[PDB]
Every structure is written in C-alpha cells, then in structure tokens.
Amino acid sequence: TENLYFQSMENFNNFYILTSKELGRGKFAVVRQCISKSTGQEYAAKFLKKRRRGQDCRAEILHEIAVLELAKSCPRVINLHEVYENTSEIILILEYAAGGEIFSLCLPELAEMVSENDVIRLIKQILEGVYYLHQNNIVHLDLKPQNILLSSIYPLGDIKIVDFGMSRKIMGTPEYLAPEILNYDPITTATDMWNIGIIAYMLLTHTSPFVGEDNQETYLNISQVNVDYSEETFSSVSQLATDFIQSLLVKNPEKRPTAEICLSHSWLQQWDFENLFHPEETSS
Numbered sequence: 055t056e057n058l059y060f061q062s063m064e065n066f067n068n069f070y071i072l073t074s075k076e077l078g079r080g081k082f083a084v085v086r087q088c089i090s091k092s093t094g095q096e097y098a099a100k101f102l103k104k105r106r107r108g109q110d111c112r113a114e115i116l117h118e119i120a121v122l123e124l125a126k127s128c129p130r131v132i133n134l135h136e137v138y139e140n141t142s143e144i145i146l147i148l149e150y151a152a153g154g155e156i157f158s159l160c161l162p163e164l165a166e167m168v169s170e171n172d173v174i175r176l177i178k179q180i181l182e183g184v185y186y187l188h189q190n191n192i193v194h195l196d197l198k199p200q201n202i203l204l205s206s207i208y209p210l211g212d213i214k215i216v217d218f219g220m221s222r223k224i225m226g227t228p229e230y231l232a233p234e235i236l237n238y239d240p241i242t243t244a245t246d247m248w249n250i251g252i253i254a255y256m257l258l259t260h261t262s263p264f265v266g267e268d269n270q271e272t273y274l275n276i277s278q279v280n281v282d283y284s285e286e287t288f289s290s291v292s293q294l295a296t297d298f299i300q301s302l303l304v305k306n307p308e309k310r311p312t313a314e315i316c317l318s319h320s321w322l323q324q325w326d327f328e329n330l331f332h333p334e335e336t337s338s
C-alpha cells in the first residue's frame with residue numbers, strides 16, 4: 055500500500071553505477087561509493103531502510119533529509135546531491151568525502167604524520183560546522199570521530215560532518231556519550247561540545263579518553279569525568295591544547311563554552327607565516 059516519494063530506482067541505476075569500494079560503514083545503513091555515468095563524478099550512496107526494529111522510519115528519514123537540506127550552504131557539513139527511493143530504502147546521494155574518517159588519524163596503529171598545526175586546523179573546521187548547526191538549533195548528538203570525514207588525506211583535506219540520524223532541536227556508542235545523556239538530563243548544544251573535546255583528545259593522544267575494560271567502567275569514567283591527563287600521555291601536547299580539551303570535558307554541561315567561544319580560544323589563534331602581518335605600530 056505504501057507510495058514512493060523520491061526519484062525511482064530505475065532512474066538511480068540509469069544515472070549511477072555502484073563501485074566495488076568498501077567504505078567500512080554500518081551493515082544496517084549501507085554506504086557505497088557510486089559514480090555518475092554522465093560526468094564520472096564520485097558520490098556516496100547511503101541506503102536507509104524505511105523499516106527498522108519493527109518501526110516505520112520514513113518520517114525520521116524525511117526529517118534527516120530536511121536537516122541536510124538546511125545545512126547545504128555549510129561546507130563543513132556533507133552536501134546532499136539527490137534522493138532516490140525503492141520499496142524498502144531511501145537512498146541519499148551524498149558528496150563523497152574521499153579521505154574517509156577522521157578516526158583513522160586517532161589510531162594507536164598509526165605512527166603519525168599529524169602535527170598540532172593540522173589538529174588545530176581540523177578542530178577549527180569542526181567548530182565552524184558545529185557553530186553553524188547550533189546557530190540553526192540543530193544538535194548532532196553523534197559526533198564520534200567516525201562521523202567526521204575528510205575530503206582527502208594526501209594531502210590532508212577538509213572536514214565533512216556526517217550522519218544526522220540522531221540530530222534534534224533545542225543508545226549511541228558508550229565511550230562517546232556525554233554525562234547529561236547518561237542522566238537523561240535534557241538535550242543541549244553542550245553535548246556536541248563534549249564530543250569536540252573527545253575528538254581533540256583522540257587526535258592529540260591517539261587514545262580514547264573514557265573507554266574502559268567494559269561498559270560499566272566506561273560509564274564510571276564518563277559520569278566521574280575520570281580522564282588521563284598524566285605527564286606521560288601529555289608530554290608532547292601543548293598546554294593550550296590541554297586547556298581547550300579541559301574546558302570541554304567537564305561534567306556540568308552549562309560550564310562548557312559554546313562553539314563560538316571555542317573559536318576564539320588562544321589554541322586556535324595562528325598566523326599563516328606566508329602572509330604579511332600588519333602590526334599595531336603603523337609606519338606613519
């Protein structure tokens with residue numbers, strides 16, 4: 055009895071070809087690389103099932119599409135290109151973020167080529183995107199590093215925030231949940247700022263700030279905000295980076311700075327050495 059809204063599957067297959075590339079995303083909302091047959095341009099195709107856990111999800115998918123559409127003008131948020139639909143799926147044709155996940159730069163596995171200068175730039179770009187979301191009363195609520203992508207890694211490109219499946223107005227992965235989520239306090243923009251704190255910590259230390267031996271220990275670490283700031287873990291991390299993280303990883307969401315205040319943090323203030331600085335004392 056369900057009528058389809060978006061462009062037909064026959065049109066999808068006419069205009070695009072799926073590639074064999076493995077994108078390492080979920081088994082329940084598959085994301086595949088695809089190519090426009092006309093232009094050769096690469097896209098990501100995300101296949102969202104309309105029925106999940108015995109529930110109709112089409113309204114929720116429609117809301118997610120509404121959020122991506124509102125963020126079209128923000129280059130820090132993945133762009134939505136087209137939408138298709140078949141019996142069981144709504145397919146989002148997304149801008150392809152060829153660098154993959156920022157998570158890859160946070161690995162123990164990686165002996166690293168990521169400088170503090172690069173971290174500063176990535177965090178600044180993340181903050182630009184989240185500022186834009188918060189200004190439009192959207193809280194992402196799933197800003198794990200797996201949901202922040204890169205336009206490239208060689209060289210290091212630009213940030214693309216993805217997956218607005220949990221986004222709201224003003225049950226994630228345990229280690230990424232803010233303390234207010236664990237207390238069922240209401241949703242605040244401050245929850246996203248907590249996650250930015252985690253991202254910075256992981257980029258700089260290549261370790262998870264809260265994860266424990268098991269979920270019970272993870273929840274203990276989060277609700278107590280028990281974070282390793284030891285000299286060993288932070289011997290190659292600047293005080294200013296430490297300050298930025300510590301201002302975000304605080305229990306009380308109301309004490310966390312806004313994305314806007316973060317963008318003014320001293321850590322992020324940097325002059326591009328190839329530009330001619332104009333000092334306060336002028337030549338006249």
Ligand SMILES: CSc1ccc(-c2cc3ncnc(SCC(=O)O)c3s2)cc1
Nearest residue numbers: 077085098148149150151152154216217
């Ligand atoms: C293993 S190398 C690799 C390279 C690129 C990518 C991806 C590119 C890309 N561009 C847009 N969206 C996505 S995931 C979107 C979503 O999960 O909601 C993705 S995942 C993932 C992995």
